[PDB]
Design a protein around this ligand. Structure first.
Ligand SMILES: *[C@@H]1O[C@H](CO)[C@@H](O[C@@H]2O[C@H](CO)[C@@H](O)[C@H](O[C@@H]3O[C@H](CO[C@H]4O[C@H](CO)[C@@H](O)[C@H](O)[C@@H]4O)[C@@H](O)[C@H](O[C@H]4O[C@H](CO)[C@@H](O)[C@H](O)[C@@H]4O)[C@@H]3O)[C@H]2NC(C)=O)[C@H](O)[C@H]1NC(C)=O
Ligand SMILES: *[C@@H]1O[C@H](CO)[C@@H](O[C@@H]2O[C@H](CO)[C@@H](O[C@@H]3O[C@H](CO[C@H]4O[C@H](CO)[C@@H](O)[C@H](O)[C@@H]4O)[C@@H](O)[C@H](O[C@H]4O[C@H](CO)[C@@H](O)[C@H](O)[C@@H]4O)[C@@H]3O)[C@H](O)[C@H]2NC(C)=O)[C@H](O)[C@H]1NC(C)=O
Ligand SMILES: *[C@@H]1O[C@H](CO)[C@@H](O[C@@H]2O[C@H](CO)[C@@H](O[C@@H]3O[C@H](CO[C@H]4O[C@H](CO)[C@@H](O)[C@H](O)[C@@H]4O)[C@@H](O)[C@H](O[C@H]4O[C@H](CO)[C@@H](O)[C@H](O)[C@@H]4O)[C@@H]3O)[C@H](O)[C@H]2NC(C)=O)[C@H](O)[C@H]1NC(C)=O
Ligand SMILES: *[C@@H]1O[C@H](CO)[C@@H](O[C@@H]2O[C@H](CO)[C@@H](O[C@@H]3O[C@H](CO[C@H]4O[C@H](CO)[C@@H](O)[C@H](O)[C@@H]4O)[C@@H](O)[C@H](O[C@H]4O[C@H](CO)[C@@H](O)[C@H](O)[C@@H]4O)[C@@H]3O)[C@H](O)[C@H]2NC(C)=O)[C@H](O)[C@H]1NC(C)=O
Ligand SMILES: CCCCCCCC(=O)OC[C@H](COP(=O)(O)O[C@@H]1[C@H](O)[C@H](O)[C@@H](OP(=O)(O)O)[C@H](OP(=O)(O)O)[C@H]1O)OC(=O)CCCCCCC
Ligand SMILES: CCCCCCCC(=O)OC[C@H](COP(=O)(O)O[C@@H]1[C@H](O)[C@H](O)[C@@H](OP(=O)(O)O)[C@H](OP(=O)(O)O)[C@H]1O)OC(=O)CCCCCCC
Ligand SMILES: *[C@@H]1O[C@H](CO)[C@@H](O[C@@H]2O[C@H](CO)[C@@H](O)[C@H](O)[C@H]2NC(C)=O)[C@H](O)[C@H]1NC(C)=O
Lengths: 331, 343, 331, 343, 331
């Protein structure tokens, strides 16, 4: 009887006070939360945030909503949620979030005979992630999602992961070209403010950046230009025009790489690991041009070939030592 | 719960939220405190900054007195729209967002004596006028002013909940500054007169100091090494004219490339920053180095260099000999004056 | 006689329960869907998504809305949809969608005497398309549009394409600046989750990128620079200034092409075919300058012309062989 | 006031806004005219254009006949939501805005005979599919199509208020175009057949012609002078091997720098524009000029030039002599064919 | 006595028809407007608009809102403006406007015993300003804000600046990084459309661009390179490698300066005053390289030393003459 189901739901909402939490004035209401990750759209270093799409399900029991005589789980229209109490769950580090509303609002309400409420939302959220980019691009970030109740303290509400470690699924669905998911973790804790103590659920991912793009596009061109600057060491010292043109161009080429690479990479206003590598490579090409200026300065006075001969060994060896220390430190 | 439902109904029975507490009788005192969960990024181009706060306001409303089994009512945030709240706005705010996911990020608490605690989670983009004459060695005081939009000081006054220093709290790990250091904040209150009356203004100044580490590696060091590099040409013999002309011309191109990209991180301000003076002087040295070679090349008597055997050869230019000392010394003197002036 | 129609519409909505689907508790309601593609605005590799504008029609029968006595199909003001049950259809892979609202909400409600409901929406949607960019710019992409019921399982609702393969129109009229729609496909399938089986309608396109733009903009400039570096092999090795200036300038110009190339996606950090071609071309120009460094280093000790003579053949032959492997692999 | 209140209440009493006027009896005729207050910028990258208009619609509704002291009722725009209005939409619109500051930018006037004048202020981003093969010497006809979304031509038809040419009016000071000239517009009306029926569509085509003056200085002149500059190398003596190789290689870099900046202002179209062909040919002339020197350098018998006071000296290359004529003549002929084809 | 105040305010809104203007059907209602400018944000050449934040106060008298017995000016909650008639004031040239809504809507309603209404809004608006950039960056713009009634004609409403020429305050406090406000003006007029004659209030600023930024950024780097190209005239003509490299690099630098500068400046698709200067300086550095080509062309057959000597005077004198014509024409 479609009329009997309508009458049962109308009776529930005639004497239901949304201003009061379940078991108001008594024991705290326990809210179980499970997340089904749909995708992670973009991880932004410039904005220090990431975009996450997920199915956010909350699970709590409200004895006022218990109904008898209907052996079914009522799937109601999403507009009935406006007449029911829901937890005031918010994301502390979220910067901009919305619920998808095409073709209708992506919202689910499911009721159970004992009063249990399953409440699911399809949410796309941009959550803040203060990334430490000191090892960029060989860095490993840890981006979390803080889940907390805003108005209700631990004496009113309790959060827990429904299913334990199995509360968050779909992590294997995450396909990021620049990152790979190494580990995800579920944390349940209490956070104390001036207004009281609040339940906190934390979902954190450890993102490992892939180095392949930067080896091909940034590290390799820098190395070959630095190796290119060593060609001057194998040219005779009377070829002043040839060796200055090689030295000046590579110095200018190295700057052009840096000034244009930074315009592509995320322009964070501090020094990254690559900024140490590019500045180190600039020094090598700068020392190579300074190396000839020393040779050109003293072959006039009278071991002149010795400076060139030792430069063919010291520069490749020191750059190898520079790479050995650099790569062992950041890997 | 049924008892509490009756109490809430009695509070709002005959309650008019269009009128402030004690309207026509006394000034409404609003006690305010701010908890900064994250001090967001600062934008030099827009002369703005972002801050995420818990904005707490407290005031007394005798119409909301109640007696019951509990002393504090922790109600849903929809109750805030059923009662009078202060019309607090941020004077320098540009575009602020009150977060509403998954519910309105607001809390309302009513004590039995009529005291209200009203908190909301906000993301505020406030104006911060910046004088960038010392960029990047510059410091700023970004204000955050708030008060009543419509109620004058004869109707609504604002006070800090505790001592002004302790009324603004920054989260220990809530910093989102990439190139600034939050040295601290100063808190003050005053009166501002406008075309509609006198209003109470509550002012918080955040003192920022930009970190120069990024611009030392990116701009100053390449500019200093390029200028030092351009003075290396003074140690080449005056006979190698094509070699030194390539050296002088290509470094001016290198300086031009570094000059062009250095202005990418600044607003098109009409004045010259401290970094613009440094680049202008660095450009002057590189250009002056090529003019120095052009003078030496003008007097060059012989086109052939020293053969290494002993027929006369060009003597080392007196201009070149002095330029090896004057150019490094003047650039060293300028740096000593430049960095002492700004640091 | 609009007075009679006003009575008819009010009679239909008198006691109409919007939370219950047609034939609630009985056989599932079959929803037929046909799409008229107005345009495909943008296809973004950076965001891995595309923007689609379409007329989205849903066909289902509701005996509660059957009417008699009026030989007409009732086209009502779109605000009636707020008083009618509509399917909770959403797009599973969309990132942000909206219904146009100028001058009014772009929504159509058309009733039929047998109870058939036509529900049309003009929707612009940004749908997720996980593009494989390994063969860029000679790649082919398969972007889909997943249509699913959010709350209702297959036991309550059913989806199908109205008209078979003709359900989607306007594809052949689409013009994309960077792509051409080779083919489109319609799939109907049932998808099983832990919460039950849900209907799925999938609309997919196969996009083939046009290589013509990149031949003139990226490939040919890189080939000509590579051929330019071979000119050094035809210059006398005694011309140290001439051959180093040619070699250094071309190497830098290769970096200038590589750095400044908007069309090579310097923004997203992924591996592409064009990245391997530009890196391969950079190796050739780097070996040509390094080739002179070996000739310049030993023409004083003593076969010197042999290295130059062989480079006139090996470099053009190896670059041709490099292009043979590259073009056979990516085409 | 009370009398006028009763008149407004009487009009909406029993009014059913879900039914169009004359439903089931006659076709609803809507008269439309457009006043373009500003023809906004055109975006090549998005293949769209912006336009700000006063969009006026007029139709007859017998249910709104009234008798009173005034013949025309100039009412609050909130009255529009309570009555029936046409569901006009722009077929090629991408994202339109109905301005809401400080109030909904709408007007509604009801004449005593039931005629309704309904106007709103809109910003419309409409699709303008562009074929950019002739860029930057291309002309476009950006359309603006509007009609009923749900009502077929058997229910709602659209007509222009006056003669079609005079029904679209552009303000004299309403040209926000920078790189386009609005030559005029053509106004038509036809029937579009879709999968839901036949609909009346009103079409306005704005004919735009791009201005080439910006691209002549920015791209065409530097490219022509760079090609001419690369042909200056032909007039240098064949003994200046380092000098002519520097001339050849640097100009190929200059062409690369010029070529790269030419795709800053274009959409990533897969086809080649008219400017792409010019740069490609400019690359061929620049590339062939360095290849010409390589041929000349390949036969060069002596590394020393004429001493000035006369031993054998290299003659002027017959390849070089003919290149001074062939290269400029072929580039002049290419320019004549190129510019005549597109202009 | 708030209860007495509650009775007064409730009586005012009982029987209040927001659809009608005060003195509806009678003489027009006069509306006085004063603006307190808070800031001008971003005067953009790319979008040909500027952003204005202001306190927009409208003064009008509504006899229906007159109250007696309260010696106070009633400042009410801002939500009362939705229950009162307000003028349908709009900004004709605005592109995107919003009223600030944190913490509540930045709206003010103040009533007075005589029936005068003070209505304040804190508005950020982006208003179109069609700039003539022919003399950019030495240009002077005139940006306006057009204030008009949309539906009500001059027979229904009148607009005037309350306070005469003091109706707009805060102009002297405005600080623009790129512009300086020279003068502001207040105009009251009527604008005739097809639907009638409407009142118009116009606030206009005259902005004079500061040249200090562009002297150090664009003009001086071009002048120094042009002077750099004159160095070739002081080199002997036997040094072909030196003078061509000097001329070529200056020409390439000028292209680099021009191409990179245009990527900084707004994308103005027409020729600016600066575009004439940069293109004019390119010609000078192009004639300097062409000057050597003539000297190199005739020193063999044959005057040559005379051409080089005269170029040391003609080029500095012509470039000074070009600057004199350029700067007197634009300044
Ligand atoms: C958080 O805050 C935002 C506002 O900043 C809220 O959005 C607004 O929510 C209101 C309450 O639900 C809505 O009334 C309001 O209007 C909605 O607009 C949606 C489409 O958005 C476009 O159109 C609006 C209106 O012109 C325009 O403002 C916006 O910029 C877009 O162009 C509609 O889909 C939506 O319809 C929903 O409700 C109607 C009710 O009859 C149903 O019939 C529909 O089926 C649908 O369920 C509605 O009309 C919202 N948008 C605004 C103001 O822009 C969020 O809701 C807040 N979130 C929470 C969790 O509270
Ligand atoms: C990204 O970075 C965040 C921090 O910014 C990391 O979050 C931390 O994760 C660690 C785990 O790796 C957490 O440590 C664990 O916390 C649990 C919860 O503590 C709360 O509850 C207990 C009572 O149950 C209180 O006593 C406590 O004060 C807290 O309120 C503990 O239960 C865990 O203890 C377990 O292990 C210890 C031994 O190590 C045993 O002695 C215990 O009995 C128990 O078995 C543990 O301490 C930490 O709390 C998290 N911090 C925050 C702020 O959330 C993310 O892990 C990181 N991301 C990744 C991928 O690494
Ligand atoms: C982009 O990429 C997607 C995949 O990511 C492609 O989508 C697939 O398209 C193929 C067709 O090319 C689909 O294959 C078809 O599946 C239908 C449904 O199968 C389901 O249901 C049946 C029962 O009805 C189950 O048995 C089955 O296990 C599935 O659960 C089939 O009905 C189709 O059958 C057709 O082929 C068989 C022979 O193989 C014939 O016997 C039939 O008569 C009939 O012709 C068919 O197998 C596949 O399901 C799609 N996958 C997904 C995930 O959607 C897109 O096609 C691709 N885009 C482009 C443009 O290529
Ligand atoms: C930016 O550019 C705009 C134009 O686009 C300039 O705006 C103009 O400003 C001038 C004043 O500087 C305006 O001229 C004045 O208009 C007043 C209003 O005219 C209207 O009303 C009268 C009847 O009262 C009608 O006849 C008329 O048609 C209009 O409808 C006049 O009252 C003024 O008259 C006074 O000066 C004149 C001489 O100029 C005397 O003869 C009179 O006796 C009297 O003293 C005057 O004509 C002009 O209308 C404005 N134009 C527009 C389109 O608004 C801005 O000034 C400019 N910005 C800056 C900073 O300069
Ligand atoms: C910005 C630069 C401005 C430069 C302005 C330069 C203004 C100017 O005219 O200088 C010329 C003069 C000498 O220049 P320099 O030494 O290069 O020229 C020598 C000079 O001409 C001798 O007279 C020649 O010997 P002689 O008599 O023919 O036998 C000698 O021939 P050779 O023996 O080599 O074959 C020439 O090389 O320089 C200064 O006095 C330095 C002043 C301080 C300069 C301080 C610069 C910072
Ligand atoms: C990209 C074009 C490539 C073209 C490649 C064309 C390659 C090609 O075919 O070269 C052969 C020849 C080279 O002439 P070029 O003047 O360059 O070389 C002379 C030639 O080698 C003579 O044989 C030499 O005289 P000799 O008897 O040995 O004493 C003479 O010595 P010297 O007197 O100087 O000491 C050399 O200078 O050119 C033509 O016949 C005109 C071609 C016009 C081609 C026009 C193409 C537009
Ligand atoms: C309503 O929902 C409840 C909870 O999910 C369902 O109960 C589960 O039923 C499955 C049937 O296979 C069992 O395996 C689970 O153990 C049950 N769990 C609990 C907590 O009871 C119930 O079957 C659903 N009813 C309907 C009609 O769908």
């Amino acid at each position: 009887n479609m009329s009997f189901v309508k009458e049962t739901v109308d009776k529930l909402l005639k004497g239901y006070d949304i201003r009061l939490r379940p078991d108001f004035g008594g024991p705290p209401v326990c809210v179980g939360m499970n997340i089904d990750i749909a995708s992670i759209d973009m991880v932004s270093e410039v904005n220090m945030d990431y975009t996450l799409t997920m199915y956010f399900q909350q699970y709590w029991r409200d004895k006022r909503l218990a109904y008898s005589g209907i052996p079914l789980n009522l799937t109601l229209d999403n507009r009935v949620a406006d007449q029911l109490w829901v937890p005031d769950t918010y994301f502390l580090n979220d910067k901009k979030s919305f619920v998808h509303g095409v073709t209708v609002k992506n919202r689910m309400i499911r009721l159970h005979p004992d009063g249990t409420v399953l409440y699911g939302l399809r949410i796309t959220t941009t959550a803040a992630c203060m990334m430490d980019l000191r090892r960029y691009p060989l860095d490993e970030q840890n981006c979390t999602l803080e889940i907390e109740s805003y108005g209700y303290t631990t004496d009113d509400i309790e959060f827990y992961w429904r299913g334990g470690d199995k509360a968050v699924t779909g992590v294997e669905r995450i396909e990021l070209p620049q990152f790979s998911i190494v580990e995800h973790r579920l944390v349940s804790r209490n956070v104390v403010f001036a207004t009281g103590a609040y339940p906190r659920l934390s979902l954190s991912f450890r993102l490992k950046r892939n180095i392949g793009y930067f080896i091909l596009q940034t590290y390799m061109p820098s190395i070959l230009i630095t190796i290119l600057s060593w060609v001057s060491f194998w040219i005779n010292y009377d070829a002043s025009a040839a060796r200055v043109a090689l030295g000046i161009t590579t110095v200018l080429t190295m700057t052009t790489i840096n000034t244009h690479l930074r315009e592509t990479l995320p322009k964070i206003p501090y020094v990254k690991a690559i900024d140490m590598y590019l500045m180190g490579c600039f020094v090598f090409v700068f020392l190579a041009l300074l190396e000839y200026a020393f040779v050109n300065y003293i072959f006039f006075g009278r071991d002149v070939n010795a400076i060139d001969r030792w430069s063919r060994i010291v520069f490749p060896f020191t750059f190898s030592l520079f790479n050995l220390v650099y790569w062992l430190y950041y890997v | 719960t049924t008892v509490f439902t009756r109490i809430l109904d009695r509070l709002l029975d005959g309650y008019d939220n269009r009128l402030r507490p004690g309207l026509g009788e006394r000034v409404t005192e609003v006690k305010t405190d701010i908890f900064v969960t994250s001090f967001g990024p600062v934008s030099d181009h827009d002369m703005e900054y972002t801050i995420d706060v818990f904005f707490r306001q407290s005031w007394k409303d005798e119409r909301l007195k109640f007696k019951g089994p509990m002393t504090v009512l922790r109600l849903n945030n929809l109750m805030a729209s059923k009662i009078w709240t202060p019309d607090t706005f941020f004077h320098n705010g540009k575009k602020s967002v009150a977060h509403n996911m998954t519910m309105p990020n607001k809390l309302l608490r009513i004590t039995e004596d009529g005291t209200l605690l009203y908190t909301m989670r906000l993301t505020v983009r406030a104006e911060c006028p910046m004088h960038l004459e010392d960029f990047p060695m510059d410091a700023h005081a970004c204000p955050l002013k708030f008060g009543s939009y419509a109620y004058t000081r004869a109707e609504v006054v604002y006070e800090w909940t505790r001592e002004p220093a302790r009324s603004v709290v920054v989260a220990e790990d809530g910093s989102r500054l990439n190139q600034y250091d939050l040295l601290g904040q100063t808190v003050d209150s005053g009166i501002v007169q406008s075309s509609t009356g006198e209003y109470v203004v509550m002012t918080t100044h955040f003192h920022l100091k930009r970190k120069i580490g990024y611009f030392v590696i990116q701009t100053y060091l390449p500019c200093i090494m390029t200028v030092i590099l351009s003075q290396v040409s003074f140690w080449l013999n005056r006979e190698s004219v094509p070699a030194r002309t390539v050296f002088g011309v290509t470094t001016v191109l290198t300086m031009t490339t570094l000059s062009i990209s250095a202005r990418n991180s600044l607003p098109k301000v009409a004045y010259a920053t401290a970094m613009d003076w440094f680049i202008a002087v660095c450009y002057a040295f590189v250009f002056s180095a090529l003019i120095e070679f052009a003078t030496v090349n003008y007097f060059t008597k012989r086109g052939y260099a020293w053969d290494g055997k002993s027929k006369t050869f060009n003597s080392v230019s007196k201009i070149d000999r002095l330029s090896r000392i004057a150019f490094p010394l003047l650039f060293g003197i300028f740096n000593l004056v430049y960095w002492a002036t700004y640091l």
